[PDB]
Ligand binder design. Structure first.
Ligand code: B12
Ligand code: B12
Ligand SMILES: C=CC1=C(C)/C(=C/c2[nH]c(/C=C3N=C(/C=C4\NC(=O)C(C)=C4C=C)C(C)=C\3CCC(=O)O)c(CCC(=O)O)c2C)NC1=O
Ligand SMILES: C=CC1=C(C)/C(=C/c2[nH]c(/C=C3N=C(/C=C4\NC(=O)C(C)=C4C=C)C(C)=C\3CCC(=O)O)c(CCC(=O)O)c2C)NC1=O
Ligand SMILES: C[C@H]1O[C@@H](n2cnc3c(N)ncnc32)[C@H](O)[C@@H]1O
Ligand SMILES: C[C@H]1O[C@@H](n2cnc3c(N)ncnc32)[C@H](O)[C@@H]1O
Lengths: 330, 329
């Protein structure tokens, strides 16, 4: 189709950092009868996933991604400066979770909803619940749409969703943070999930008590201890650490913290496949940057030792180690 | 003065969270002969400062600011989808420092440069030097334009500017992070500063050391110093005793920020950085029902620990004097 050609031309503009070409392409596609929603979901969204794949593989830098993403935002704005219908359906507030800076997925949702006649107030990146809740109380929208892209944000998602529901505002949720097929929204009972902006719009067209886990609490309270334990194990087993400068040591510490935090998220939703997928993803990220993924196994074994009398955490760690071992046999 | 009226109408749209009205206003102003640069600098920029004032005073929430800022971004895009000239002058890369997420000031610079015929690649928020440097080596732009809004980022700015210069790329710098009249850029010799997008464009139209041990100590001992501040608050500041996890975390975050701004102040050896930060902090906290006297408690505790660091000691003294003076009026 013209969509194959459109994707190639769009990626070429994004890779070149050429905002005018990307926007002009989008406008010409609209002029030729390509639906706005198709430009946003089949062209822009698809390009952004691929940019992520390239970054993950260390084939693109952060600068290259940033250039592209900013242009994709301009494409989304240009397309919405044309496809938006007069607001006749009601009012939706679109917000990212506190600590969630992937605004572009949420912007696509906002634009698609506007195209169907919703009045949308877009709040975008990182809205604290303490500020979002009074905003919902102030304006009483028909729905709040909460976007989460990182599964590590799932504990926060659960809290923010609960707080929003307590205002009586219907909650829609989405983004990659709930998993590609919405699994972690369903596990949490977190609002109504949908996979895409199109599906969100379809939902809106219809005629329509959580005890703390001490094991999760321990992963938060003992984070520094666990990072330190991982580092000490790397000191014993992983030779490159001995020659790391400040920058590489800081990256190691950052990554160790992220390992603990994803383990915490996995335990929170009690789905070991969160930690499993995280560990295999981490292996790919590190390998692509010349860091042996065996380093991860060293850290996981060390954390498992410290927490071996925490049965749920132990199970998740075991699952992570098995997933890594399986990944590394290729 | 259509600009007085324009400002009122714009702020009304922003306060209402009405993107269509704000964009339509901008377009009507352009249609009536208001220069694009005027819409961006005299209307949009001015509104964003005022949103900052309202937030600082706890009169606007984060949600209210976020709604407004996203609309201002759409105004900037709409105005640039009209005012940008064909690229004929050369190539500028526009980037925020690593850890700097105020992209909008940099977007205004980008749009104004495009209006003067520059090809601009906008990288926006938070670009690590390790990624920016190879990008500059790859593309050899005529300049890189670095934006910094938070003075706490100044030590990083100094390093990133040096790294960019080492690629042979001329560096322009700006944003609030370089201080009043660019003072902190100028004392460091960190690139060529300019106050506004207009002035940046004007510059482009022309024919063109030992590590700091006191700074190092403020970074290395950050946790210790936060803890010292907290222990003093425990001894002297009654509300802390009744704080839940959330308020305790906010206290800890703020104490860290106090240390980090002290580090920046010492780094550029300008006590007025720390002084202005402390008085700003007092206003922020007071507006949220937290006694600014709490800040004095923390500062006195940090001064005790670091009393044999002469530069740091001086900056802390200056901060305490600035706070005392602020609190008598
Ligand atoms: C651009 C980008 C960034 C940008 C985003 C800026 C912006 N303006 O949004 C920046 C640079 C800020 C960024 C930062 C980071 N990111 Co990033 N980034 C991306 C990237 C490449 C594209 C995102 C995008 O544009 N999505 C647009 C399209 C693709 O979204 P979409 O899913 O089709 O959207 C639909 C659905 O999600 C759904 N939906 C979404 N929200 C909602 C809400 C509701 C209510 C409903 C019903 C539906 C719904 O409907 C949408 C529209 O149809 C992705 C790759 C990816 N696969 O997403 C990563 C990716 C998400 N990032 C990733 C990472 C790791 C990071 C960082 C941690 C990196 C770092 N160390 O700094 C940080 C974290 C920042 C934070 N705290 O959030 C990883 C996350 C992997 C993981 N471990 O979970 C990814 C997946 C890349 C990868 N590794 O392959 N990132
Ligand atoms: C919008 C906003 C945000 C948004 C920004 C999103 C975005 N898309 O940019 C978000 C929510 C992300 C944000 C976050 C925060 N912010 Co804020 N925010 C603002 C606000 C209200 C407006 C910024 C803006 O739109 N500027 C547009 C206009 C006003 O910029 P301008 O100065 O006119 O731009 C010109 C010049 O600076 C110059 N220039 C700028 N860059 C360059 C570069 C070059 C090369 C040149 C030549 C010139 C140049 O030319 C420009 C164009 O003419 C300001 C208020 C303010 N006074 O700026 C604060 C403000 C900057 N934020 C502030 C704070 C404290 C924060 C947070 C720390 C809050 C928090 N705890 O989360 C974080 C920090 C995030 C980070 N790490 O960077 C404070 C900082 C005070 C301080 N201590 O330094 C301010 C001053 C608000 C206040 N207190 O009054 N913020
Ligand atoms: C357990 C052992 C372990 C070690 C030894 C480790 C080290 C490590 N990680 C690095 C980078 C990195 N590591 C990550 C990983 C992540 N980014 C994210 O946002 C998330 C969630 C992850 C995953 C945990 C990334 C993306 C970089 C590259 C940083 C950059 O942009 O330059 C680097 C720098 C690479 C270089 O400069 O050569 C080192 C040394 N990480 C580890 O986990
Ligand atoms: C020394 C004593 C000291 C104390 C006791 C302190 C406490 C403190 N600061 C708070 C919020 C806050 N404190 C800040 C301050 C900042 N935000 C920034 O980005 C920066 C740089 C600052 C300044 C340091 C802000 C903006 C909030 C509001 C956070 C929110 O909205 O949740 C709160 C929560 C208020 C409430 O919910 O009732 C407390 C308790 N801060 C202190 O510094
Ligand atoms: C998911 C996206 O996050 C971006 N990314 C990775 N590390 C950083 C960083 N330190 N600062 C800003 N953006 C970053 C990458 O460009 C990636 O594509
Ligand atoms: C400078 C701007 O930073 C925003 N701001 C303050 N705290 C947060 C936060 N936790 N998350 C996101 N934005 C925030 C405010 O809305 C302010 O206006």
């Amino acid at each position: 189709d013209i969509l194959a050609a459109g994707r190639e031309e769009l990626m070429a503009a994004l890779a070149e950092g050429d905002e005018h070409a990307a926007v002009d392409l989008a406008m010409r596609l609209l002029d030729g009868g390509v639906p706005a929603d198709v430009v946003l979901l089949e062209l822009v969204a698809d390009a952004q996933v691929e940019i992520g794949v390239l970054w993950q593989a260390n084939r693109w830098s952060v600068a290259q991604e940033h250039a592209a993403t900013a242009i994709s935002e301009r494409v989304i704005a240009a397309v919405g400066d044309r496809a938006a219908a007069a607001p006749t359906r009601g009012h939706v507030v679109v917000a990212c979770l506190d600590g969630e800076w992937h605004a572009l997925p949420a912007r696509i949702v906002a634009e698609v909803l506007r195209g169907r006649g919703w009045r949308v107030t877009f709040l975008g990146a990182s809205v604290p619940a303490a500020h979002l809740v009074p905003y919902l109380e102030e304006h009483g929208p028909d729905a709040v749409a909460l976007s989460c892209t990182l599964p590590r944000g799932l504990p926060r998602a659960d809290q923010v969703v609960a707080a929003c529901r307590a205002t009586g505002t219907p909650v829609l949720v989405g983004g990659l943070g709930f998993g590609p097929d919405g699994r972690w929204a369903r596990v949490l009972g977190a609002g109504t999930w949908a996979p895409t902006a199109r599906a969100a719009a379809d939902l809106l067209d219809r005629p329509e008590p959580r005890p703390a886990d001490p094991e999760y609490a321990a992963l938060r309270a003992r984070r520094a201890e666990l990072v330190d334990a991982g580092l000490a194990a790397l000191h014993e087993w992983f030779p490159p650490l001995r020659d790391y400068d400040a920058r590489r040591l800081d990256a190691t510490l950052d990554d160790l913290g992220d390992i603990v935090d994803h383990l915490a998220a996995s335990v929170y939703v009690d789905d070991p496949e969160l930690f499993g997928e995280f560990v295999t993803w981490t292996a790919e990220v590190l390998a692509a940057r010349g860091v042996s993924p065996a380093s991860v196994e060293v850290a996981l074994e060390a954390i498992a030792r410290v927490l071996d009398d925490h049965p749920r955490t132990r199970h998740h760690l075991d699952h992570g180690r098995r997933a890594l071992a399986a990944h590394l046999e290729h």
